[PDB]
Design a binder for this molecule. Structure first.
Ligand SMILES: Cc1cc2nc3c(=O)[nH]c(=O)nc-3n(C[C@H](O)[C@H](O)[C@H](O)COP(=O)(O)OP(=O)(O)OC[C@H]3O[C@@H](n4cnc5c(N)ncnc54)[C@H](O)[C@@H]3O)c2cc1C
Ligand SMILES: Cc1cc2nc3c(=O)[nH]c(=O)nc-3n(C[C@H](O)[C@H](O)[C@H](O)COP(=O)(O)OP(=O)(O)OC[C@H]3O[C@@H](n4cnc5c(N)ncnc54)[C@H](O)[C@@H]3O)c2cc1C
Lengths: 567, 567
């Protein structure tokens, strides 16, 4: 049985081991060590890094770049014996939130390096590969890049065309292709590269093309890159095309098993995924301070504007989004640290939620600031520009919603299918969070359980209706993913606030209020959303019309109607 | 009785004169003249203007600037006898949509000039003032700017501090102050300036400070400006502080009546307001073509992506937003052309709706484009940056929502108050759009009427509950404004699509579908929103908590909670 809450909720189960009580994973020595790192990392970003300058220069300033190498920032999760800082996922989350608060451009360059660029060596490396490569990766002497995307292939990784052909001797592969929009592509000396290779079936010998992952050194020869791409935001992060022309890659540089490269890619992206929410929780914390400062000090209509309801609601909504995001990030990191093997749905939810939350929070900060928010000097517009890409890379949020919905449906579908399987021989809910949620949160706990039942009822009905065809019911899948996102958000804040109440933390009553306020509205979204899927007779009309309207646009090449004058 | 649909709907009335049938205002000669202008204006923007270049240079290229003067673009609504092109509001809307489609930076510089910068001379000018100033304004020899905002005063125009003191002789006023974020402030030779002046009461002689509007020439002396402000978008538009130091303004340069300057400002902003929706309808038309092109031609997962439901729904929603916006823009312009005196609520709705629609449409275009959408070359990110300010200037959308809700409530409140007024002498719905909506749209017509009844029921209940105190119930006012916005959107598209059906226009069946699809979801938002206001026992809990959460943030100066680790 899966220990994943998200897997369980699609089946109408409460599987709470990875959610309650809100996890604590650090020992006393890890806690003290982390404290001694937070201080210097924070001072570095406060005193040495200049995010506006990096944005203006479209690169990280050299003194900052060298300082980050010295700080250990290129190898935070590399074991100390291999030249790194040796942090676990929860410790890493804490430092990533500092970087996210201060400079997302620096954040993406460091994350492209270690969250995904050489992460596969950490996850799948042999002892030889780890010992050869990790020390110089950790010091930043060799920068890394994750090389998957191609001109033809972004969301559909399985469709990549870069190829790696084995030598007759078996000693090397010859790699040919090009990769697109690679973070650090122009800086990296080590590339994790995904390429199609012929793979022999162990039983029959039949050869089939499958993806294999490779660790590639720039020094192998035949590797060049294009000029830095100009983009809306994260301008300090290098993004370049990378070209592989007749590159000889030693057979011992295969990462994992030949033909298992798609799995390697997906595991890397999954493993790294919590880091986005961690970073963005930090972004939001800094942005909220800016908005609150503005609202505290701006007089309009005879009062400071924090005295007006419209501003109060904006600020309240911002902090709820920050708290949910941060709670998700640390829950997933803790689950990883505690040895969870099934967290992919939760990680995807955290990425979707955190990226969209940070976008909304920063957009509302601009609105609170008024005309000032649109100006360059305050720096908020720079953060908005940086944020836009987080909804697109590391899995587009649209594809991640489909993933969440289909992955959640999978085990329920399997159960349902098992029902009518056996041959005929003719010849002879009770669900509750009582005891897990703190008593002061019992009502919100009940809202969550009722919402879970509503959700699971629709999941079952739609799987019975659509069976394996549900994969093509995208309008429905997006709406189920949204239910799933809100349900996980509810339980994560219920868990966090419950622990705060049980432990008598000083902010526990404020957290209770954040949780209750979040849960009232999330429960209503799930109720209304599930009713729209199950019992609304106009929902199918909407779906038919979305398809018809879009078809008409495509036939025309744009808007079909003229303006009212007709010309 | 008011002829405004929006005024009526707050009272539970269907006042349809300014909505059905969808207005047509141009005569045959105006139509032909407009056609002969659309062609050269479109070619100019296609062949001469370069929006990416203007953005990069942070100014309009000189050849473009001079070309626009030659094209007549600085005086579109100035009568031909006074040097202009002589267009009515509906003709102006048609040309503004071209500019909005191509270059919002150019759009704001031209709009700051004529939609608001000298608009007060058009609306309130004496014959002498019109004849003296309009010819050089229309040719672009003298650029104009609207000078209201100050460091202390943005949304609260009544609080401005710039002063104008009359001379003993009465021949001039001495103007002193500074204005902030003035579009064309560094380019203009003519300023409409709002300043506090002493005003004598005609009856008692008592002096009170009130705002007066002035036409100010740079050549009067004492006027300087600051350097161009750097900003997120519309970078080609000049934005500068303007300083008035001991400026002698002739008494004959008062615009309108002494002390009536607040009214003058509000009328200018109201009169100009439809132009925003017109421009943004054009922006959206161009952006939708870009998204549709991308979706038509991008293969992913073995198909062109327009074959996937998620993309279909995005595209359908984009065109519905464009169609609503465009329909609103031309309805308000037609109402103005036909002599409506009560259109301020509708104009505000159009500004709110169009600015938020264009933002959402462009944001979704980026999402459809994937990583490409974040890059500079495609130009979509530039349009997103340009759009952000449209939710803030010309009235912040938050203040405009409060305006819509309170202005709509006003006449209903007056009626309710009249009920318990008379002294006691002790000594002796049926509403229907039948006959207005086309029969093929009868169901959607009924949705609109039911939604109007739901809305008006809540308006009445809340006015009885809160009376004049409703002005401080901002959470409620925002939610009523949203209902009003959706209700007007429904009837505008019902009206437009009905005319298309009645006239047998070639796109009528597509328009019917746009209308029906829009109305199903808008009706549901109004139903759920009104139920939340009237019958939801947790709504007051949410409001109390928004205020409590915000208060706690303000006390702290930002987020109250630490991260889960506590440090
Ligand atoms: C600044 C930047 C940095 C990046 N960093 C890296 C990096 O370091 N390494 C790397 O390998 N890549 C990197 N990427 C690539 C990024 O991950 C991809 O852009 C992303 O995966 C989207 O792929 P795409 O742009 O090809 O869009 P597509 O996959 O073409 O998708 C286009 C649109 O269609 C939608 N869509 C696609 N398929 C479906 C479907 N079946 N059903 C419904 N909707 C669908 C998508 O959600 C999207 O909205 C980077 C990109 C950028 C811009
Ligand atoms: C590029 C640019 C060009 C501009 N062009 C011009 C121009 O040509 N001429 C000119 O005069 N001005 C111009 N403006 C100014 C613009 O109109 C103002 O910025 C706008 O009116 C907002 O005022 P503010 O920035 O002072 O915000 P504030 O009024 O301080 O408002 C701040 C925030 O508080 C909210 N708020 C304020 N009061 C209340 C309340 N009572 N209840 C609830 N919420 C409230 C607002 O909605 C906003 O979210 C320009 C500004 C910019 C940035």
């Amino acid at each position: 049985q899966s220990m994943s809450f998200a897997v369980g909720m699609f089946k109408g189960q409460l599987t709470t081991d990875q959610v309650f009580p809100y996890p604590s994973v650090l020992n006393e020595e890890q806690t003290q060590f982390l404290k001694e790192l937070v201080e210097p990392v924070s001072r570095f970003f406060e005193e040495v890094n200049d995010p506006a300058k990096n944005d203006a220069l479209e690169m990280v300033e050299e003194t900052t770049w060298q300082g980050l190498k010295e700080l250990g920032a290129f190898g935070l999760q590399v074991p100390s014996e291999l030249g790194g800082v040796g942090l676990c996922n929860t410790q890493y989350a804490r430092l990533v939130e500092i970087v996210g608060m201060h400079d997302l451009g620096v954040g993406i360059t460091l994350g492209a390096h270690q969250s995904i660029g050489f992460k596969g060596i950490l996850l799948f490396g042999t002892k030889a590969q780890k010992e050869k490569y990790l020390p110089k990766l950790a010091s930043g002497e060799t920068v890394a890049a994750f090389c998957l995307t191609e001109p033809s292939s972004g969301s559909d990784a399985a469709s990549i065309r870069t190829s790696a052909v084995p030598s007759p001797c078996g000693k090397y592969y010859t790699l040919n292709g090009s990769k697109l929009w690679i973070s650090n592509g122009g800086l990296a000396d080590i590339f994790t590269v995904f390429a199609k290779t012929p793979v022999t079936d162990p039983a029959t010998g039949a050869v089939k093309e499958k993806i294999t992952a490779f660790v590639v050194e720039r020094g192998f020869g035949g590797i060049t890159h294009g000029p830095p791409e100009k983009k809306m935001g994260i301008k300090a992060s290098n993004t370049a095309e990378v070209f592989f022309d007749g590159v000889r890659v030693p057979s011992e540089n295969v990462l994992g098993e030949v033909g298992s490269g798609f799995k390697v890619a997906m595991h890397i992206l999954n493993n790294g995924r919590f880091g986005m929410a961690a970073a963005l929780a930090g972004t939001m914390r800094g942005i909220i301070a800016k908005a609150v400062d503005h609202a505290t000090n701006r007089t309009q209509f005879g009062e400071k504007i924090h005295n007006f309801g419209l501003i109060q609601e904006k600020l309240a909504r911002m902090v709820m989004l920050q708290y949910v995001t941060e709670s998700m990030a640390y829950m997933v990191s803790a689950n990883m640290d505690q040895g969870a093997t099934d967290f992919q749905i939760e990680a995807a939810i955290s990425k979707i939620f955190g990226s969209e939350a940070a976008w909304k929070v920063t957009d509302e900060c601009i609105q609170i600031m008024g005309g000032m928010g649109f100006m360059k000097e305050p720096g908020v517009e720079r953060v908005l520009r940086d944020l836009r890409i987080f909804r697109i890379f590391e899995g587009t949020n649209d594809i991640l919603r489909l993933f969440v919905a289909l992955q959640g449906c999978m085990d329920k579908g399997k159960e349902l299918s098992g029902l009518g399987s056996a041959l005929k021989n003719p010849f002879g809910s009770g669900l509750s969070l009582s005891g897990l949620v703190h008593p002061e949160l019992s009502r919100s706990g009940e809202l969550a359980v009722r919402a879970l039942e509503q959700f699971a009822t629709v999941v079952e009905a739609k799987l019975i209706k659509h069976k394996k065809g549900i994969v093509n019911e995208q309008f429905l899948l997006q709406r189920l993913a949204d239910g799933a996102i809100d349900l996980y958000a509810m339980v994560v804040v219920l868990s966090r606030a419950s622990r705060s109440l049980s432990e008598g933390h000083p902010t526990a009553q404020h957290e209770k209020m954040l949780c209750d306020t979040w849960c009232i509205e999330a429960a209503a979204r799930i109720r209304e959303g599930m009713a729209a899927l199950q019992s609304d007779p106009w929902q199918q009309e909407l779906y038919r019309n979305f398809k018809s309207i879009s078809k008409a646009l495509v036939e025309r090449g744009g808007v079909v109607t003229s303006n009212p004058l007709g010309f």
